[PDB]
Amino acid sequence: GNYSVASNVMVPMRDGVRLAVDLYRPDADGPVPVLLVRNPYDKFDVFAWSTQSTNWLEFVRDGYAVVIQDTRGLFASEGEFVPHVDDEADAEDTLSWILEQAWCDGNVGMFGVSYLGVTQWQAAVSGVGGLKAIAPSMASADLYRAPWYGPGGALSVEALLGWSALIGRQLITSRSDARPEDAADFVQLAAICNDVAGAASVTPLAEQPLLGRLIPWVIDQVVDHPDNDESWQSISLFERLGGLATPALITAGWYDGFVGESLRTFVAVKDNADARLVVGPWSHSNLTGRNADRKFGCAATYPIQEATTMHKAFFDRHLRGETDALAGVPKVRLFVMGIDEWRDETDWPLPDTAYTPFYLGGSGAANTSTGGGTLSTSISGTESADTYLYDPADPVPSLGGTLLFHNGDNGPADQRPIHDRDDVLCYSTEVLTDPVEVTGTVSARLFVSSSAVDTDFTAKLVDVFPDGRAIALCDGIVRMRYRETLVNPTLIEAGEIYEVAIDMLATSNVFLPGHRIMVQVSSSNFPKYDRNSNTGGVIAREQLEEMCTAVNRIHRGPEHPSHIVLPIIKR
Amino acid sequence: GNYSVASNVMVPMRDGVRLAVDLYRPDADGPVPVLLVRNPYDKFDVFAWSTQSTNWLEFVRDGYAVVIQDTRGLFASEGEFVPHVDDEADAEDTLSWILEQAWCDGNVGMFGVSYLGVTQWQAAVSGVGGLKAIAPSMASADLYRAPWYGPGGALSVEALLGWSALIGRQLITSRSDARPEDAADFVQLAAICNDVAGAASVTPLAEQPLLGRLIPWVIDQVVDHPDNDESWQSISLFERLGGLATPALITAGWYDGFVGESLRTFVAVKDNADARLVVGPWSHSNLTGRNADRKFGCAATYPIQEATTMHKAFFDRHLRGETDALAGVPKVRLFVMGIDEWRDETDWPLPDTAYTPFYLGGSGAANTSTGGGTLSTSISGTESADTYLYDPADPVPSLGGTLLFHNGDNGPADQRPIHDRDDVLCYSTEVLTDPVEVTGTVSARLFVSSSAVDTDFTAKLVDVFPDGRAIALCDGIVRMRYRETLVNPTLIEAGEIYEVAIDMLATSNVFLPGHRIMVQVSSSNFPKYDRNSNTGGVIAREQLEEMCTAVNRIHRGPEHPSHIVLPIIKR
């Protein structure tokens, strides 16, 4: 139950640069199993992130050592900070160092959330033998797909500016001797904090005299590389995940920006080692289970003690050889919305998932919520088309979903404020008499056409409540140039009909009797995603005045059966 | 920078019962200054409360020892748990014990939030010399006035049931060997968590077969003692605060249930020792500065590092004799809403506070928001009266304010959902052309009359935004039997006109040009307060069917100048 803490122990990397760590070590006779956390937001500040993770001091009382490290160039660590690029090598050297210490019994694990989760995948691919398990929570193994861009090839601009500004504020606040221009830089950073959509609204987007100066990576890496090119593959871990045999306790949230990629990591490692999955109804900044228009119940609050118990059982199994430690612990545990209950599963995706087409249709125009758009499991008998004008100067505002910094505390947002927009097409089933469970990956196949040589298409799945609330579930986007590949974009011919796939990530929701299933289709979702210029140019470099409007069209009927693919579960 | 942690060190009280503590002690040559935290929610679980307090590990790295204690009868501590009653003696014996240890240099301080704040006042009154400073955050020195009842003599029923159930769940979850009936007891407790208004809705209120069994104090002490009698004075610290000379760093929140009493502690100790005040726009469960319909800005987020710095400066001054440590640190720091800025003051109440009457008036009925009720600095020229029916079966629902467990995450709640009720009288100024700052204690003097021999009257101050939002600021209630004294209630004669005072706690808000100042007057605010039966009986014992409706009346004009007293600040 007793332990000691040593601060600012300097660990040398291969290049001579030393990273700072704190050592939480139990009162032990010999060497102990060790847990490593790699953190860019000050290893000293444990309270800021731990509430979203585990009561990990319990690990130390139970005989684990915990090592928390400032990443390179931040706080007590030497070197220069650039996101992602140094973390593979630094983690590898750090694990090596730990394995050489007298207090390490040769078993090392990791845990942490977000960036503290990503860093675990970056550590795992080094193949270091002593690393026996990781527990990456709300993390990604493909930085392009999350959180900076996405599978649809659009820039997550609110994510980028919100985070960069958080790092900027952090760099200024942590400075030894304050520079004179700090205060001015700060006011700009606080302004971004209070109005991320405003900062994302400037054109050209790539012109960030503030953020591009405080942290040049924001432009040099992210904004300047809209294609999933070599710069991105260089830091991507995902393709190497299949070759690994490292157990992973993976945590995600239905409304968390990383959810798509978190789930994909599980699918990629489950066949080669003991993987575990836990998914709750949380967003990045809200793990209470309470939202403005949607309450998931007290049991949906991030169950920190249950997580602590599970992590410990996980580590006891893999770092201490306790063969029975994970007895009774499910492989997959999901919070199933609608019924609003935790439920254990044997796999993700669920076995007996029926990937079911729900076809777009209806008489008249599907524009707005009072239009005639329908969803049905039967193909629409009549060939029609819905048409709207998308104008970059007036994009569809983001409401909930997987937003990170711009109002990222209200995932299951009521969609009624945007229901009357002409560029928001609505399609919904009739009122349900039997519950319909949708749990798994969600995507849409749309037959589309544009007046422009590039544009976007969005799809959002929505649960319509009897009282009128239209609650967002999951959403996705496709940038048409990237409709076939995120690597080698080609433009489109105006007027030509394309079949495009829209990756809407995932969800778990029972649509109860009395509810409707609704899909919203549009061509913007700002600032969750930057807005397409409709020009085929380099979007982030275009002035707004120089962008074009586009007349976009959704085709539906027997020859163009646009549909959403729902993962139907029937029990 | 280095330290060690010892767990479950048993400290013997005067009666032989041993309380458990954890010792966070720096690597030191000799004895060190010590900080004590008394906690009923597991001393091990530091992450749960610390984010609402300080980064206190910084104190340990800087050479302070920190002692965290399980209160009597909870977790690792021996004995039996009853709220409040053992905490004076236990704190005194604990301080004595600390002062006897080899690692204590004879200087002791405390810090903590809520119950961890109350316990500091309970410690301070023991007169132990080694206790040099306390830092009670969102605390009270009068348990009747907060959080269980209030200055108006109404029961804070959502506070009582919400907390009791939290303690109940805690007792079950912490049990060594689970009893068989635990699971059944739990479901009832989780049901209370998800629907506190429902549990508060039962009649008779005093019939709590669950909570009264898990924790009998809920009835034996709280529900059964609606009068501020000897049972309450026995645990009240407030009258002894004047005799103290202990510096206190006092933190409060404008929407926190303890705010009234927190502020009063400052007023009671400021003349005898170095007191400090910090007040932010927070409620108990929401310190983000973000609410459903009201955003206070990133700077309003609980500034945990700035608090840590201030606490440390405070302790360095009073526990380490660093005479200059508090140089540049303001006496009072308020978050002033409206302008939404932090601001330093030299005193609370503010010097040059102009306690200004705003008179009720207007032609026609003031019922609902579309009535004709007015507020004016001139006495209403015409004698009129507003009249409504209050029916206990249909009370005015609580919206924001200082709610604790029932939707306590939305203090500045938009009041429009209750604006059309006939029993909600609205009075407002014309649209403002000049800013009006209201910062200080707020109260109302109403000329009232009832058809009943007892009833309630409520008053709520509201900022009406140009866009229509009617944001709650502070509110209060008066239970008519307690209109003169909370100790010796007398009933009222039906039809007789009384001048009653309604303590509306406090606020700090600039009503900007384009806004209106609004007051809502009614006779219920449920479940923030239990509902008056209108019978003169023992309210908590009455069946709903047996309660009466009351025809209540607000009198206004030259002979009955009902008014709200606003603390006007002009700079």
Tab-separated table of N, CA and C in Angstrom, chain A residues 1-8 22 24 27 43-48 50-51 54-57 61 169 190 193-194 288 290-292 295-299 304-305 405-409, chain B residues 1-8 22 24 27 43-48 50-51 54-57 61 169 190 193-194 288 290-292 295-299 304-305 405-409:
chain	number	residue	atom	x	y	z
A	1	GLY	N	0.809	-1.202	0.000
A	1	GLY	CA	0.000	0.000	0.000
A	1	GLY	C	0.848	1.261	0.000
A	2	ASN	N	2.131	1.121	0.322
A	2	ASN	CA	3.023	2.276	0.421
A	2	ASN	C	3.902	2.455	-0.808
A	3	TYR	N	4.243	3.705	-1.117
A	3	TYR	CA	5.093	3.992	-2.268
A	3	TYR	C	5.818	5.323	-2.145
A	4	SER	N	6.690	5.597	-3.112
A	4	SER	CA	7.440	6.848	-3.155
A	4	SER	C	7.395	7.428	-4.564
A	5	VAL	N	7.597	8.737	-4.667
A	5	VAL	CA	7.547	9.426	-5.950
A	5	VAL	C	8.838	10.216	-6.172
A	6	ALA	N	9.512	9.947	-7.284
A	6	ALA	CA	10.721	10.684	-7.639
A	6	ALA	C	10.438	11.541	-8.867
A	7	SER	N	10.795	12.821	-8.805
A	7	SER	CA	10.428	13.766	-9.859
A	7	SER	C	11.593	14.158	-10.758
A	8	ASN	N	11.291	14.377	-12.037
A	8	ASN	CA	12.267	14.872	-13.003
A	8	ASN	C	13.523	14.006	-13.146
A	22	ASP	N	8.486	11.086	-14.023
A	22	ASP	CA	8.276	10.898	-12.592
A	22	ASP	C	8.096	9.402	-12.306
A	24	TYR	N	6.652	6.581	-9.823
A	24	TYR	CA	5.827	6.171	-8.698
A	24	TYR	C	6.154	4.707	-8.448
A	27	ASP	N	6.820	0.281	-2.283
A	27	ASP	CA	7.813	-0.244	-1.350
A	27	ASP	C	7.965	-1.737	-1.600
A	43	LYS	N	3.542	16.020	-16.995
A	43	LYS	CA	3.459	14.817	-16.174
A	43	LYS	C	3.059	15.123	-14.729
A	44	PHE	N	3.345	16.347	-14.281
A	44	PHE	CA	2.991	16.790	-12.930
A	44	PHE	C	1.479	16.920	-12.765
A	45	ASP	N	0.821	17.404	-13.813
A	45	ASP	CA	-0.616	17.652	-13.779
A	45	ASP	C	-1.406	16.360	-14.000
A	46	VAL	N	-1.458	15.514	-12.975
A	46	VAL	CA	-2.115	14.216	-13.096
A	46	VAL	C	-3.636	14.316	-13.038
A	47	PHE	N	-4.142	15.333	-12.351
A	47	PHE	CA	-5.582	15.461	-12.138
A	47	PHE	C	-6.337	15.811	-13.419
A	48	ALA	N	-5.655	16.476	-14.349
A	48	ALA	CA	-6.302	16.975	-15.566
A	48	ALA	C	-6.814	15.866	-16.485
A	50	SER	N	-6.484	12.167	-15.563
A	50	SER	CA	-6.782	10.918	-14.866
A	50	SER	C	-8.278	10.627	-14.661
A	51	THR	N	-9.085	11.672	-14.477
A	51	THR	CA	-10.527	11.492	-14.300
A	51	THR	C	-11.186	10.920	-15.558
A	54	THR	N	-8.353	6.352	-15.238
A	54	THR	CA	-8.406	5.353	-14.183
A	54	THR	C	-7.934	5.955	-12.866
A	55	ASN	N	-8.338	5.342	-11.755
A	55	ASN	CA	-7.743	5.650	-10.460
A	55	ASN	C	-6.403	4.922	-10.294
A	56	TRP	N	-5.434	5.268	-11.138
A	56	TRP	CA	-4.212	4.470	-11.291
A	56	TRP	C	-3.273	4.385	-10.080
A	57	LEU	N	-3.472	5.243	-9.083
A	57	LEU	CA	-2.718	5.129	-7.833
A	57	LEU	C	-2.997	3.784	-7.161
A	61	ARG	N	-0.442	1.089	-5.282
A	61	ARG	CA	-0.724	0.459	-3.996
A	61	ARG	C	-0.748	-1.066	-4.107
A	169	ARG	N	-1.222	27.992	-25.968
A	169	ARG	CA	-1.435	28.522	-24.626
A	169	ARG	C	-0.525	27.820	-23.631
A	190	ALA	N	-6.890	32.893	-26.531
A	190	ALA	CA	-8.122	32.813	-25.756
A	190	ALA	C	-9.326	33.116	-26.643
A	193	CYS	N	-10.152	30.021	-28.358
A	193	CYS	CA	-10.828	29.147	-27.398
A	193	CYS	C	-12.333	29.432	-27.315
A	194	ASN	N	-12.691	30.711	-27.250
A	194	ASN	CA	-14.092	31.122	-27.121
A	194	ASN	C	-14.870	31.098	-28.432
A	288	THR	N	-19.911	12.781	-18.685
A	288	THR	CA	-20.912	12.746	-17.618
A	288	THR	C	-22.128	11.893	-17.976
A	290	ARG	N	-24.566	13.275	-19.342
A	290	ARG	CA	-25.604	14.311	-19.372
A	290	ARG	C	-25.330	15.311	-20.502
A	291	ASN	N	-26.323	15.550	-21.357
A	291	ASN	CA	-26.194	16.555	-22.414
A	291	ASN	C	-27.410	17.492	-22.433
A	292	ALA	N	-27.305	18.611	-23.147
A	292	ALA	CA	-28.363	19.629	-23.152
A	292	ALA	C	-29.777	19.076	-23.367
A	295	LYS	N	-30.190	12.754	-21.884
A	295	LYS	CA	-29.636	12.219	-20.646
A	295	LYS	C	-29.553	10.714	-20.803
A	296	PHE	N	-28.372	10.144	-20.570
A	296	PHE	CA	-28.182	8.707	-20.748
A	296	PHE	C	-28.323	7.923	-19.442
A	297	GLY	N	-28.468	8.641	-18.331
A	297	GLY	CA	-28.634	8.008	-17.032
A	297	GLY	C	-27.340	7.933	-16.239
A	298	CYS	N	-27.458	7.869	-14.912
A	298	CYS	CA	-26.288	7.851	-14.033
A	298	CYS	C	-25.304	6.723	-14.354
A	299	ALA	N	-25.808	5.590	-14.827
A	299	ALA	CA	-24.923	4.465	-15.143
A	299	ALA	C	-24.031	4.728	-16.358
A	304	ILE	N	-15.316	5.212	-13.677
A	304	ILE	CA	-13.876	5.216	-13.441
A	304	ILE	C	-13.363	4.087	-12.546
A	305	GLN	N	-14.121	3.712	-11.519
A	305	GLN	CA	-13.670	2.619	-10.658
A	305	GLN	C	-13.779	1.248	-11.343
A	405	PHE	N	-13.492	20.534	-30.034
A	405	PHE	CA	-13.308	21.789	-29.298
A	405	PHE	C	-14.447	22.781	-29.496
A	406	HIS	N	-15.019	22.802	-30.696
A	406	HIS	CA	-16.179	23.650	-30.964
A	406	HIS	C	-17.434	22.969	-30.434
A	407	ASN	N	-17.926	23.435	-29.288
A	407	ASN	CA	-19.104	22.845	-28.649
A	407	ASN	C	-19.064	21.320	-28.626
A	408	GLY	N	-17.967	20.767	-28.106
A	408	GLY	CA	-17.765	19.328	-28.088
A	408	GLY	C	-18.306	18.632	-26.852
A	409	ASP	N	-19.225	19.292	-26.150
A	409	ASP	CA	-19.792	18.742	-24.921
A	409	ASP	C	-21.264	18.354	-25.084
B	1	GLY	N	11.343	17.998	-4.405
B	1	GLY	CA	10.451	17.494	-5.429
B	1	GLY	C	10.034	16.056	-5.169
B	2	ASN	N	10.755	15.373	-4.284
B	2	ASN	CA	10.487	13.962	-4.008
B	2	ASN	C	9.693	13.748	-2.727
B	3	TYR	N	8.884	12.690	-2.700
B	3	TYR	CA	8.084	12.382	-1.519
B	3	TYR	C	7.689	10.916	-1.443
B	4	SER	N	7.048	10.547	-0.336
B	4	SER	CA	6.574	9.183	-0.129
B	4	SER	C	5.141	9.210	0.391
B	5	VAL	N	4.419	8.114	0.181
B	5	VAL	CA	3.025	8.019	0.594
B	5	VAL	C	2.822	6.782	1.471
B	6	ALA	N	2.298	6.989	2.674
B	6	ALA	CA	1.993	5.881	3.574
B	6	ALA	C	0.481	5.761	3.719
B	7	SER	N	-0.048	4.551	3.554
B	7	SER	CA	-1.496	4.352	3.515
B	7	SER	C	-2.057	3.712	4.778
B	8	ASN	N	-3.272	4.116	5.143
B	8	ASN	CA	-4.000	3.518	6.259
B	8	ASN	C	-3.263	3.566	7.602
B	22	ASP	N	-3.929	8.828	5.044
B	22	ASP	CA	-2.766	8.625	4.187
B	22	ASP	C	-1.795	9.796	4.378
B	24	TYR	N	1.229	11.968	2.846
B	24	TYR	CA	2.083	12.366	1.738
B	24	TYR	C	3.164	13.252	2.336
B	27	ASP	N	10.591	14.355	1.046
B	27	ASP	CA	11.910	13.931	1.506
B	27	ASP	C	12.560	15.095	2.239
B	43	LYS	N	-10.425	8.591	1.125
B	43	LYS	CA	-9.159	9.308	1.016
B	43	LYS	C	-8.309	8.817	-0.158
B	44	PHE	N	-8.526	7.564	-0.564
B	44	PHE	CA	-7.808	6.972	-1.696
B	44	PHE	C	-8.210	7.629	-3.014
B	45	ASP	N	-9.497	7.942	-3.137
B	45	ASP	CA	-10.042	8.509	-4.365
B	45	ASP	C	-9.765	10.011	-4.453
B	46	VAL	N	-8.521	10.367	-4.760
B	46	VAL	CA	-8.121	11.771	-4.794
B	46	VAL	C	-8.594	12.490	-6.054
B	47	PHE	N	-8.754	11.746	-7.142
B	47	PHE	CA	-9.096	12.350	-8.427
B	47	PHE	C	-10.522	12.895	-8.461
B	48	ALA	N	-11.402	12.312	-7.650
B	48	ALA	CA	-12.825	12.662	-7.680
B	48	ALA	C	-13.110	14.099	-7.241
B	50	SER	N	-10.300	16.508	-6.272
B	50	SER	CA	-9.173	17.417	-6.470
B	50	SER	C	-9.314	18.380	-7.660
B	51	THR	N	-9.976	17.938	-8.729
B	51	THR	CA	-10.181	18.795	-9.898
B	51	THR	C	-11.066	20.001	-9.571
B	54	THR	N	-7.499	21.940	-6.035
B	54	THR	CA	-6.149	22.408	-6.309
B	54	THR	C	-5.291	21.259	-6.825
B	55	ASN	N	-4.213	21.595	-7.529
B	55	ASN	CA	-3.176	20.617	-7.842
B	55	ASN	C	-2.246	20.413	-6.640
B	56	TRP	N	-2.798	19.896	-5.545
B	56	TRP	CA	-2.118	19.913	-4.245
B	56	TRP	C	-0.832	19.085	-4.117
B	57	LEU	N	-0.568	18.200	-5.075
B	57	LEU	CA	0.707	17.481	-5.103
B	57	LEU	C	1.871	18.463	-5.242
B	61	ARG	N	5.576	18.587	-3.349
B	61	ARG	CA	6.840	18.815	-4.045
B	61	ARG	C	7.562	20.053	-3.513
B	169	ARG	N	-25.360	4.706	-1.769
B	169	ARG	CA	-24.654	3.975	-2.814
B	169	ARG	C	-23.216	3.712	-2.395
B	190	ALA	N	-30.165	4.106	-7.515
B	190	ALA	CA	-29.890	4.578	-8.865
B	190	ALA	C	-31.118	5.274	-9.444
B	193	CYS	N	-31.061	8.685	-8.192
B	193	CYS	CA	-30.043	9.418	-8.946
B	193	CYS	C	-30.591	9.976	-10.266
B	194	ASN	N	-31.336	9.149	-10.995
B	194	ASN	CA	-31.884	9.538	-12.298
B	194	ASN	C	-33.140	10.398	-12.212
B	288	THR	N	-17.193	24.237	-15.390
B	288	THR	CA	-16.642	24.456	-16.727
B	288	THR	C	-16.838	25.889	-17.220
B	290	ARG	N	-19.400	26.560	-18.866
B	290	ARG	CA	-20.296	26.318	-20.001
B	290	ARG	C	-21.638	25.757	-19.514
B	291	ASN	N	-22.742	26.379	-19.923
B	291	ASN	CA	-24.073	25.867	-19.590
B	291	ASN	C	-24.962	25.794	-20.839
B	292	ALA	N	-26.092	25.096	-20.742
B	292	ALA	CA	-26.965	24.871	-21.900
B	292	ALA	C	-27.271	26.130	-22.721
B	295	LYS	N	-22.841	30.803	-21.785
B	295	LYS	CA	-21.410	30.522	-21.827
B	295	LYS	C	-20.702	31.703	-21.193
B	296	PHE	N	-19.851	31.439	-20.203
B	296	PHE	CA	-19.163	32.515	-19.496
B	296	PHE	C	-17.758	32.781	-20.041
B	297	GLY	N	-17.313	31.939	-20.971
B	297	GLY	CA	-16.003	32.102	-21.581
B	297	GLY	C	-14.943	31.211	-20.955
B	298	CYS	N	-13.901	30.895	-21.726
B	298	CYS	CA	-12.841	29.998	-21.262
B	298	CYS	C	-12.189	30.454	-19.955
B	299	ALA	N	-12.107	31.761	-19.736
B	299	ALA	CA	-11.482	32.266	-18.511
B	299	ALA	C	-12.305	31.975	-17.254
B	304	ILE	N	-7.789	26.058	-11.965
B	304	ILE	CA	-7.166	25.207	-10.959
B	304	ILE	C	-5.699	25.523	-10.660
B	305	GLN	N	-4.922	25.890	-11.676
B	305	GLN	CA	-3.520	26.223	-11.422
B	305	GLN	C	-3.358	27.572	-10.704
B	405	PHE	N	-28.315	18.415	-6.873
B	405	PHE	CA	-28.352	17.100	-7.521
B	405	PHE	C	-29.388	17.000	-8.634
B	406	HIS	N	-30.518	17.678	-8.459
B	406	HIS	CA	-31.539	17.726	-9.505
B	406	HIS	C	-31.141	18.759	-10.551
B	407	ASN	N	-30.639	18.289	-11.691
B	407	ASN	CA	-30.182	19.174	-12.764
B	407	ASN	C	-29.333	20.334	-12.252
B	408	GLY	N	-28.292	20.010	-11.484
B	408	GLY	CA	-27.444	21.018	-10.869
B	408	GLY	C	-26.264	21.451	-11.720
B	409	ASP	N	-26.347	21.203	-13.026
B	409	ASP	CA	-25.259	21.539	-13.940
B	409	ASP	C	-25.630	22.683	-14.888
